[PDB]
């Protein structure tokens, strides 16, 4: 299988530099080049440019040029790029895929670098408690909080990643404060609330926050 | 330096239904064009390289044609799964993409579940106080959600989302969340999230009663 596997979201203030990791599947950097593509949060698609591991030689596009460096490591497996003079609308999800030169057959999962000056924060996680007021014909609604945090983005999955049937992980509202707030829900048997265990795994990567949150009836 | 230009900007359409997307290049570009899948929150996943080669594991329901300017991909018979943003981009030139084009599905009505959560003993205790309203699995996307506290229509105090739309029912579902202080909170007795929905021939109100 070919899997490309990038490092975590990341803040970071104006003027600074950022460096995304990407570490790629085995036979990927003996056969493929790797492109970097970033996305603007609700804008499009934007090819910075590409490095071929055979060689090392690299190629960027106009608008990067000079701000861009691109490296990979052989040894590792491992695709790099670093952008330098992080200015606001440097704020994207970055993707790193693999580059045949003629089209990206496999794209990483994104890392999402927010430049700005404000502080870092972590978010609270809460239950939302199974009840009577939660239930409808046999089915019962669960959730967590995610409460007060910045940057974004907060991930969560449900027992490991073992529970997505039915699970619902709201995008993100951005409070007064300028910190933001999330919901993950998710409905389940109202049978067995007795006998299985719903834990919301809540990832802010930013501000190393990494809650796993048991919630009870 | 080329271009490229996606028409229309989003498309409704019912399951079943033939969808056709167009990509136009500012020049020439052979047949170097590929069309790509973007759910939310996810990386692109390509679908058809070369303007019209169909990538392996991709349903035959998608296809690509075209050469030189004008490009289409094509959606034959329109599926749940195939909610997505798509995208064209062009190989001649240093990669260009297209600016997308939302597809959407269009479904029968459905009334949303509605469930409330008073805020947990741990929050309480932080001194605050979020009571979250959740409406499940209602089509289409436009609900109206009323905070009433002690009767008292609420204002100023309250966030919302929407989900994008479900990969296998179509639906969407939403998540309001009210918030004040613990102080606020325990000078009130009743809780209640007011929904208007077009499955619904009257507001449904989901309330509790503090304690």
């Known amino acids: 299988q070919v899997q490309l596997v990038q490092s975590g979201a990341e803040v970071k203030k104006p003027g600074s530099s950022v460096k995304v990791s990407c570490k790629a599947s085995?036979?990927?950097?003996?056969?493929?080049?790797i492109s970097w593509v970033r996305q603007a949060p609700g804008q499009g698609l934007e090819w910075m440019g590409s490095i071929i591991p055979w060689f090392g030689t690299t190629n960027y596009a106009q608008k990067f040029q000079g701000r861009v460096t691109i490296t990979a490591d052989e040894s590792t497996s491992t695709a790099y790029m670093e952008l330098s003079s992080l200015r606001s609308e440097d704020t994207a999800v970055y993707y790193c895929?693999?580059?045949?030169?003629?089209?990206?057959?496999?794209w990483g999962q994104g890392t999402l670098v927010t430049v700005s000056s404000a502080s870092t924060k972590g978010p609270s996680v809460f239950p939302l408690a199974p009840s009577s007021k939660s239930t409808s014909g046999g089915t019962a609604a669960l959730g967590c909080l995610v409460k007060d945090y910045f940057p974004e983005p907060v991930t969560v999955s449900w027992n490991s990643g073992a529970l997505t049937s039915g699970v619902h992980t709201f995008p993100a509202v951005l409070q007064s404060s300028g910190l933001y707030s999330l919901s993950s829900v998710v409905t389940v048997p109202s049978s067995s609330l007795g006998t299985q265990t719903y834990i919301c795994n809540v990832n802010h990567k930013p501000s190393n926050t990494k809650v796993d949150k048991k919630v009870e009836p | 330096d080329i271009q490229m230009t996606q028409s229309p900007s989003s498309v409704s359409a019912s399951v079943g239904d033939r969808v056709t997307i167009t990509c136009r290049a500012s020049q020439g570009i052979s047949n170097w064009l590929n069309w790509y899948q973007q759910k939310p929150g996810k990386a692109p996943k390509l679908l058809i390289y070369?303007?019209?080669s169909l990538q392996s594991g991709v349903p035959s329901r998608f296809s690509g044609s075209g050469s030189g300017t004008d490009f289409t991909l094509t959606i034959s018979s329109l599926q749940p799964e195939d909610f997505a943003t798509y995208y064209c981009q062009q190989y001649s030139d240093d990669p260009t993409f297209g600016q997308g084009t939302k597809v959407e599905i269009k479904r029968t009505v459905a009334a949303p579940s509605v469930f409330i959560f008073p805020p947990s003993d741990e929050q309480l205790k932080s001194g605050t106080a979020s009571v979250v309203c959740l409406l499940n699995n209602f089509y289409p996307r436009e609900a109206k959600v009323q905070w009433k506290v002690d009767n008292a229509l609420q204002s100023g105090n309250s966030q919302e989302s929407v989900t994008e739309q479900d990969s296998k029912d179509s639906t969407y579902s939403l998540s309001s969340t009210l918030t004040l202080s613990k102080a606020d909170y325990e000078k009130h007795k009743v809780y209640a999230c007011e929904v208007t929905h077009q499955g619904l021939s009257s507001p449904v109100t989901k309330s509790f009663n503090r304690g």
């Open positions: 070369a303007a019209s």
């Open positions: 895929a693999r580059d045949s030169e003629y089209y990206f057959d496999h």
């Open positions: 085995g036979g990927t950097f003996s056969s493929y080049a």
